Design a protein around this ligand. Structure first.
Ligand SMILES: O=C(O)[C@@](O)(COP(=O)(O)O)[C@H](O)[C@H](O)COP(=O)(O)O
Ligand SMILES: O=C(O)[C@@](O)(COP(=O)(O)O)[C@H](O)[C@H](O)COP(=O)(O)O
Ligand SMILES: [Mg+2]
Ligand SMILES: [Mg+2]
Ligand SMILES: [Mg+2]
Ligand SMILES: [Mg+2]
Lengths: 464, 118, 464, 119, 227
C-alpha cells in the first residue's frame, strides 16, 4: 500500500549486482563525501535525484513501473593516494532522453546534483554513447575528406595567421594587412573572438573590404585562399543575416563561439551550413572556468564529444609548448577520440570506456597560442598531417614586414616535411635542420635571431 | 480520511480560509495601514464572476468595481473609516463591499479584504 | 620608431595613479600568482590580454592611438589571512562593447585569461554597469507591478507546487494531478526542468490536457489560475513553435532554462513575449558547476545582473534552510540588487561597488527545495511579501491526498500573516502560532505529525 | 511654392495668405476617409453637439490607474475620452498594456447605460 | 487633502535654488511678457504646461509623486538693450521621453506654449543632450571617414553641379547634359528639389537614361563618378 514518511536512498537505487545493456548511457563520477556519510548513501543520492526521486514518499509512484525508468549505481572503487575519494558508476535507460537534443542530456545528467549540502566536490570524467542514440544526429556538415578535396591541398599540414592588434583598427587598414599576409605564402586569415560590430568598425563594410583582397591575391599566385568571417551576434535574427551576405559574395567559411552563444544557436547554424554549402570553424571560449581544476568541474574530453554530435568542421585543441596550459598524454588521448572511428580503453591516457562512432566523419584539430619558428620540428612529430597551425604575433612581429614574415613560416615547414619523409629523427635533431635551411633563405636567418631564447616552463595543475 | 466539498463553495481571496472576522480584528488591520502612511478607500459591486476571451492572453472581465466617494487623503484616526462602512451598508444592502489601500510612492495597492456579503 | 622583441607587461598597462570616469566598466579579481612572479606583472598581464595585447611587438600599433583603447590596472590590495592572495581592479573604456549584446561582454572580459600558465586560481566577484550602457537593453518584459495587476492578488506572498514523479507518467494522468492541486488552494503548477518531449509523453497533447483542468478549477472557486509550460528545445525553429501554441489557447506563462540553452536564444524569447503579452519564468540549471567553490569561478551575484539586462519576470534564488547550499548574508545582499533601484556599497554583505538602474523594473525571487510546513514562520520574516514559495514533495506526500494537502499550506501562511501584522515576533515564536492554528483545522494536525523531526544541518563551503 | 523664396537677401518679410485649387486637380485625391454624414449614422446620435473630456495629469500615471478614471467619466454622461499629445510609450506606461486596460472599461460602461462609447 | 480652485503657477514650478543632474535635458528661451504680468509667473507658466499642469486643481495628483515628474525654471536674466526681454532656463527629467524618437521630443517641448494669450513672442535657441539619451539612436549611416575611403579621394574639397532649367526638359535631353558635365572634371551631379515625377518626365525612365552616361564617362577618364 501507501505509507508516508522518509526513507533511505540505498533501499532502491543501490544495486551492486547488475549487468548493463548495449542500449544504455554510462557515467563516471569522482566524489568527496562530508563527514559522517557512508560512501554508498552518497552514491545512491546521485542516481536518485537525476532521473526520478525526491526527499519523501508520494502516492503516484504506484500508477507506473519504477524498475524501468530509474537509474542505479552498480560499482564503487577507492582512489589510491587519498583517504576521502572514490569513483562511482551510474547507468541510464534509453527512453529518458529526447532525440536530437544536446540540451536535454546536460539538463538531466548535470542540473542539480553539484550543489548538495552533503558533498564537498564532484567532477565528471567520461561518458559512453550507444550507437542507437548517435544515429539521430546530423553531425559535422562536411568532414575531413570532403574538405581536403574542395581546396585541392594534399601532403602537408595547413597554415594560418590572426590579425593584431585585437581592437582599434579601421575597416580599410584591416583589409590591407590581409593582402600582404595572404600573398606571401599563407592559406587562411582570421578575426579575433571579440570583433563583432563596434563603433570603430561595423560588420557590413568589413565583409566587403576583406573580399577585395582575396581576389587580388588569388590571381597573383594561382592558389585558393580564404578568411574566417565572424557570425556571432546578440539574437538569432541577426546571426542569420550575416551568414547570407557571406554566401551572396561567394565565400567558403565562417566562425562561431559555441559556449557563450549556446547549444541551441549552434545547431541551427550547422543546419544552414549543410543546406547551403559552407564550412564551419569553432572557437572554445570560456572553457577554462569549468575545466581547469582537478577536483571540480567537467573535463574537456566530454565537451569535445558533444561538439562532434552538434556539428562542426574545425576545433581548437591547444598546444603542448606555449603560453597556455596543456599535457601531452591527455591531449594525445582526446585527439584520437576526435579523428578516429573505433577507440579502445586505455587508462594510461585517461579513457574509461570503449567508444564506436559507426561512420560519422571526423574533425580537424587546431593548435595556436604563442609559437614561433623554433617550435616547428616539435609540432610536426606530435600532430603530423591532418592539422592546422596558426601564428599571429609570430608573423606580424617580423622585422621586415608581413610578406617576408610568411616565407619564413613556409620554408621551415617544407624543410621539416622533406627531412621527415627521408628517415631522420625529428626529436634528436631539429636544430640542425633549421640551421641548415637558414642558409639559402635570408628571411629565415632574420627571424631565427630575434626569438632564440624564448621558452615557457612552469608547473602543471591537473597531472592526470 | 476526509473529503473536501466541491459543490457551492466559493472563496474570496486573502484571509478567506480563516474563521470569520469579528469587529475587533477589523480595527487592527486599519492601524497597520495607518502606521505606514497609506490611504483608505471603499468599493461595492452586485456580482463577482469572471469572464474571458477566446485567444487573448492576460485578459479577464470583472476586475473593476465602483468607488464610494473618493480616497481619504490626510486621515489619522480609524474612527472615520468605520463610520463610512455603515453609511455604505444602508444605501446598498444587497452588494459586496471591499477595503483598499494605496501606496503613492510605488503606485500599487497594498491590501484587500471583504467586510460585507449579501 | 619600430623595434622588434619582447617586453614586460608593466611598462604600459600598470598605471597606479589614474582617476576613473563615469562612463567606464569596472571589475574586481581575486588571484593567486605562481612562485617567482611579482604581484604587479601578473595584474598587468590580465588587463593586457583582454582588450589589446600579445606576447610581442607589432608594427601596426602606430597606425592608431593606444591610450584610448587600452585597459589598465590601478589598485592592488592584499587579503588578510593569506600569504599569497590579492585583489586587483581593472577599468574598461566604453567604446569596446557592442550595444545590446550580453554575449560580447562575456567574450571580452572572460574568454582567455583563466587558463594562463603563470597562475593557479582566479575568481570574478563584481561588476559596475554605467547608466549609459544599460539604456540600450530592453529588460524584463513586464516587471513586478504590471504582473500583480493582471492577476488581482495583493497583500500576501504567492504559492505553488511542482509535479512528481519527475519522469514516467502518461499525459492523462499528468493532468489529473493538476486539477486536484489547483482546486484546493494553490495558485500555480509547474513541470520539471527535464520534461520536454519524450516517448512516454509528447509535448503537443500535454498542452491540451493541462488546459482542460485550469478551466474546470477556475469556475469552481472563482479565482485566476495558471501553469508554467516548458518551451526549451533543441533548435530555435522548434522553440518558436511551442510558444505560438500557448498563445492560441490563451495561457499566461511559460518557462526556459537560460544557461544550458544559451544567451542568444534567451534574448529572442524575451522579445517575443513582449510583443504578445506573455509572462516569463527562469530556471537556473547547471549553475553550481561554476559558483560553488571559493577560489575559482564566477559568483552568482554577477550572473544575476546579466539576467536583468537580458530579460525575465521570475528567477530562482534558493532557500536558507533546505537540502541545497546557501548563506544568509550573501542572499540578503543579492536579493536587494534584484528588487531595488538604488543600492550602495556594503562590504559586510559582499558588495564592492555602487549601482544605479535608472528606472528598470524589478524581478520576483523564488525559493524552493525540501521545505515543509514547519519552516513557514522563518521564510516569511526573511523574504516578506513580493516572493514565491514552492512545495513539491510537501504537497504530494500528504497522507490524505492532493487537495487536503493544499489547505494546510494556505492556512499556515494566512495564520502567520495575521500574526505578523499585529505586532508579534516571528523569530521567538512560530511554534506556538502553528500549534494554535492546528486546532480548528484537521488537515494541519495531520501534516504536523509526519514531518516533526526533519532538519538539514551541515557545514558551509563559501563563508563570505 | 514655398521652398527657397523666403530667405532672399533682397527682402525683409513675406507671408502667404490664400490659394485656389481648380476642380481638375482635387479630383486626384482620396480625401476624408468617411466624412460627416457617414459618421453620424454609425453612432446613432442626432440633434445636439457631441461631448468629450481628456485625462489629467499629463504624465506620471500608471496603466491600471489610467483606465479606472475612464470608466467613471464615461458612465456619467460623456461620449468620448482622449489621450494627451505626448503619451506614446514610456517607462512608466507602455503602449500595449494601456490598449488592453482601456478596452475593459468601455464594455463595462456601455452595458450599464445602453449607449455607444469610445476612446 | 483636496481643495478645489485656481492657484498661481509660481508656487510649485519656480525653484530658484536647484542643482541640475548630468542626466537632464536643458533649454533656453527668450520671451516677451504682456503688460501687467511679472517675469516670473510667465517663466513658470512655460515649464508647467510642457510636462504636467493645467489651469485648475485635480484630485488624481495625489496618486503619484509630482516632485519626480515635473519641470522647473531655475534662472532668469535680463537682456542688455531692451526694456522688456529676458532669458529663461528650464530643466527636464529623463523619464519623460521615448527612446529613439525625434517626434516625441518636439511634441513635448514645443507643442502648445507658443500660442498663449499672455505672451507676445518666444524663440528657442539651444538644447543639451546628455550622453545617456543619444546612445539609443543609430545616427549617420556611414559618416565622413567611411565615405572618403569608398571613393578614393584625398587632399582637396569635392565639386559638383546642378542641372538647369529647373523644369521643362525631357528624359533624353536631361541625360546628355550630364555626360558633358561629368566628362570635363566634376565629381557629382544633382536633381532639383521639385523634380519627382511629372507629365513631361516620369521617374522610371530617367533613372535608366542617367545610368547610361555614368558608365560612358567613367571609362574615359578613369575616375569614379555619381549622381
Ligand atoms: O587570443 C589569442 O591569444 C589567440 O588569438 C592567439 O594569438 P597569438 O598567436 O598572438 O598569441 C588565440 O585565440 C588563443 O591562443 C586561443 O587559445 P586556445 O586555442 O588555447 O584556446
Ligand atoms: O528538482 C527539484 O529538487 C525541485 O523541483 C524541487 O523539488 P522538491 O520540492 O521536491 O525538492 C527544484 O527544481 C530545485 O529545488 C531547484 O533548486 P534551486 O532552486 O535551489 O536551484
Ligand atoms: Mg584570439
Ligand atoms: Mg526541478
Ligand atoms: Mg492636450
Ligand atoms: Mg535647388
Amino acid at each position: 500500500g501507501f505509507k508516508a514518511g522518509v526513507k533511505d536512498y540505498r533501499l532502491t537505487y543501490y544495486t551492486p549486482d547488475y549487468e548493463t545493456k548495449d542500449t544504455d548511457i554510462l557515467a563516471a563520477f569522482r566524489m568527496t563525501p562530508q563527514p559522517g556519510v557512508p560512501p554508498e548513501e552518497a552514491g545512491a543520492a546521485v542516481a536518485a535525484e537525476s532521473s526520478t526521486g525526491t526527499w519523501t514518499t508520494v502516492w503516484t509512484d504506484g500508477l507506473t513501473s519504477l524498475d524501468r525508468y530509474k537509474g542505479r549505481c552498480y560499482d564503487i572503487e577507492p582512489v589510491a593516494g587519498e583517504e576521502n575519494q572514490y569513483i562511482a558508476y551510474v547507468a541510464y535507460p534509453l527512453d529518458l532522453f529526447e532525440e536530437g537534443s544536446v540540451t536535454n542530456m546536460f539538463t538531466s545528467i548535470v542540473g542539480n546534483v553539484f550543489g548538495f549540502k552533503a558533498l564537498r566536490a564532484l567532477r565528471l570524467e567520461d561518458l559512453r554513447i550507444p550507437p542507437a542514440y548517435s544515429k539521430t544526429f546530423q553531425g559535422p556538415p562536411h568532414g575531413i575528406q570532403v574538405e581536403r578535396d574542395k581546396l585541392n591541398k594534399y601532403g602537408r599540414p595547413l597554415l594560418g595567421c590572426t590579425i593584431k592588434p585585437k581592437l582599434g583598427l579601421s575597416a580599410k587598414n584591416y583589409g590591407r594587412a590581409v593582402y600582404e599576409c595572404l600573398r606571401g605564402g599563407l592559406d587562411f586569415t582570421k578575426d579575433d573572438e571579440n570583433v563583432n560590430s563596434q563603433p570603430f568598425m561595423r560588420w557590413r563594410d568589413r565583409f566587403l573590404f576583406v573580399a577585395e583582397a582575396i581576389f587580388k591575391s588569388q590571381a597573383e599566385t594561382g592558389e585558393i585562399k580564404g578568411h574566417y568571417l565572424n557570425a556571432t551576434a546578440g539574437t538569432c535574427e541577426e546571426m542569420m543575416k550575416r551568414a547570407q551576405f557571406a554566401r551572396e559574395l561567394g565565400m567558403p567559411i565562417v566562425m562561431h563561439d559555441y559556449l557563450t552563444g549556446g547549444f541551441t544557436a549552434n545547431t541551427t547554424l550547422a543546419h544552414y551550413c549543410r543546406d547551403n554549402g559552407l564550412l564551419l570553424h569553432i572557437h572554445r571560449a570560456m572553457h577554462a572556468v569549468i575545466d581547469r581544476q582537478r577536483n571540480h568541474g567537467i573535463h574537456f574530453r566530454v565537451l569535445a564529444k558533444a561538439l562532434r554530435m552538434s556539428g562542426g568542421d574545425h576545433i581548437h585543441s591547444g598546444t603542448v609548448v606555449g603560453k597556455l596550459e596543456g599535457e601531452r598524454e591527455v591531449t594525445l588521448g582526446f585527439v584520437d577520440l576526435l579523428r578516429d572511428d573505433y577507440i579502445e580503453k586505455d587508462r594510461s591516457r585517461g579513457i574509461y570506456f570503449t567508444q564506436d562512432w559507426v561512420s560519422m566523419p571526423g574533425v580537424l584539430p587546431v593548435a595556436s597560442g604563442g609559437i614561433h619558428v623554433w617550435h616547428m620540428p616539435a609540432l610536426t612529430e606530435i600532430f603530423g598531417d591532418d592539422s592546422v597551425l596558426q601564428f599571429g604575433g609570430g608573423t606580424l612581429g617580423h622585422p621586415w614586414g608581413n610578406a617576408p614574415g610568411a616565407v619564413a613560416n613556409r620554408v621551415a615547414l617544407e624543410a621539416c616535411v622533406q627531412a621527415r619523409n627521408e628517415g631522420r629523427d625529428l626529436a634528436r635533431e631539429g636544430n640542425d635542420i633549421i640551421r641548415e635551411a637558414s642558409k639559402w633563405s635570408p628571411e629565415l636567418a632574420a627571424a631565427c635571431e630575434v626569438w632564440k631564447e624564448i621558452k615557457f616552463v612552469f608547473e602543471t595543475i591537473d597531472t592526470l | 480520511m476526509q473529503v473536501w466539498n466541491p459543490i457551492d463553495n466559493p472563496k474570496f481571496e486573502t484571509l478567506s480560509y480563516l474563521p470569520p472576522l469579528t469587529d475587533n480584528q477589523i480595527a487592527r488591520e486599519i492601524d497597520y495601514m495607518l502606521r505606514n502612511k497609506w490611504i483608505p478607500c471603499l468599493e461595492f459591486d452586485p456580482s463577482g464572476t469572471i469572464t474571458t476571451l477566446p485567444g487573448q492572453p492576460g485578459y479577464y472581465g470583472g476586475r473593476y468595481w465602483t468607488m464610494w466617494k473618493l480616497p481619504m487623503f490626510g486621515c489619522n484616526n480609524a474612527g472615520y473609516v468605520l463610520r463610512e462602512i455603515e453609511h455604505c451598508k444602508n444605501a446598498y444592502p444587497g452588494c459586496f463591499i471591499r477595503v483598499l489601500g494605496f501606496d503613492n510612492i510605488r503606485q500599487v495597492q497594498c491590501c484587500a479584504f471583504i467586510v460585507h456579503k449579501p
